[PDB]
Amino acid sequence: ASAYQRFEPRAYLRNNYAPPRGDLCNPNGVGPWKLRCLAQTFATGEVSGRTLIDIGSGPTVYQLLSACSHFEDITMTDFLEVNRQELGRWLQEEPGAFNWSMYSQHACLIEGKGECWQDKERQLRARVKRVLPIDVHQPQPLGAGSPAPLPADALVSAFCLEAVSPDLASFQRALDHITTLLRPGGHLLLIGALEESWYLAGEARLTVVPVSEEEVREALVRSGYKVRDLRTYIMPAHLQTGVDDVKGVFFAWAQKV
Amino acid sequence: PDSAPGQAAVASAYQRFEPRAYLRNNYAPPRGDLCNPNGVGPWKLRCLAQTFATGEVSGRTLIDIGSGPTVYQLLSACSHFEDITMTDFLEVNRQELGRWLQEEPGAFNWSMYSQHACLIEGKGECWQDKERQLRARVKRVLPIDVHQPQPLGAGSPAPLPADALVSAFCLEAVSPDLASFQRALDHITTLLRPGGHLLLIGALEESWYLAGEARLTVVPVSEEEVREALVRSGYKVRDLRTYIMPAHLQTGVDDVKGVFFAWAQKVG
């Protein structure tokens, strides 16, 4: 935990969302794969509502691109002030924001509605109402009188839980905690590392609980979800970069029942 | 009558043509705004993309007639031709294309056009791939004069005859009158093999446009005039569609009232 105090957002982005992992040109890369699960899922039309919460956003937005066209009130979160400040730099188009434009374009490409990436970024920036602090370790992760409309119609979290959880059970509880934020019938789209144990973010060196596809499945069931979709991307050699030791990436579409 | 005087007036006026001012006037926003699907930019890209998408327009070689400082007209095309020749009358335009080819920062940025084409061709291509291909397939940039009977010169580089021709806002913009236009059309048509295809785009009912200092003169033409010239030069007209310029895209850089797109195949 205290490890996250040393977490450098620029180094995290550089490590994961700049080339080689950040190169979206090759359709066999992790980035293209991630956007596709997101897009495909929403394209079904079955994940819809008015409000949505992104759990542990860090300093990234890609995870909301296809999503933002289906929910008018979007709430983003993270445990670190630094990250929240970085999200705001891109939301307010302030100086030194991160360049998500490749990711916007590709989302537009994948969705195939002939939308221009500028329109896409405009819509995201418009629907994100607030950026709130959060701790998944708390049975009320948002706090008491959170400005966020609860319960949310749907939830999105990527590379969070397993990254803030020392072991399998703390993972399971964190999932339970957030699940409380989700209106019954609501949907959860969860993405994360498979069989990862550590990863760097500058001077920070975070520990991770190595999970598996089955382990992730079981957890979702245990938390009270019907698992609608669960897919795995195996990390190609050339995307093993020594910023971490992730072996694969998983995507789950889960429905609170 | 006499072609020389008119042709000389043209050549004279174009010595004042400023490529940057031209680029800004027509390919920066509001005209350059690709976000609105009702815009001219999107309509043009869509005409090209849909056309090549039939798969009916292919081969080894292609020539772009009066490229000017622009490449957007080749984005959907370059996936279908190994060898592409670009051409323009003015050297300063040829140099402008040179900058883009060398991928210099000084160059004009077409990335929005590349992105949008990729977007409409629907193959999830990334724009950098599309651009890298175009630069790969442009085998030369040649001087051209459509008023000569051999618009490229004699014994010129271009592999002739070409399997297809592309030309956008060229003919009507260098032709003082309909007869000149027609002749220019016949001259370039000698570069196209029989059975080959011509994709033609240009202004409808336009008489002038600005390119910096240069306020140039254009022969206003209509859809039907364009149709007839094609028939006259020996083309079956496969498709001819018209875009009516929206009030808010009529910005005083010209007096264009519409834009025409012609897919025509040379009888052979």
Ligand SMILES: Nc1ncnc2c1ncn2[C@@H]1O[C@H](CSCC[C@H](N)C(=O)O)[C@@H](O)[C@H]1O
């Ligand atoms: N106790 C906690 N509760 C919620 N998030 C936490 C947390 N402790 C750390 N985090 C955050 O978990 C994030 C993991 S990195 C994930 C970034 C982004 N979702 C992406 O898809 O890349 C970090 O931003 C980190 O600050």
Ligand SMILES: Nc1ncnc2c1ncn2[C@@H]1O[C@H](CSCC[C@H](N)C(=O)O)[C@@H](O)[C@H]1O
């Ligand atoms: N006699 C001639 N023969 C062929 N092209 C000529 C010409 N005289 C002028 N031109 C060129 O005609 C161009 C018209 S502007 C069109 C540029 C580009 N094709 C577009 O799509 O915007 C100018 O670049 C000009 O140099």
Ligand SMILES: Nc1nc2cc(O)ccc2[nH]1
């Ligand atoms: N922690 C973390 N590991 C990752 C691996 C990826 O391939 C993409 C995003 C990531 N985030």
Ligand SMILES: Nc1nc2cc(O)ccc2[nH]1
């Ligand atoms: N000359 C010229 N006129 C034009 C009109 C347009 O709408 C787009 C490009 C052009 N080029």
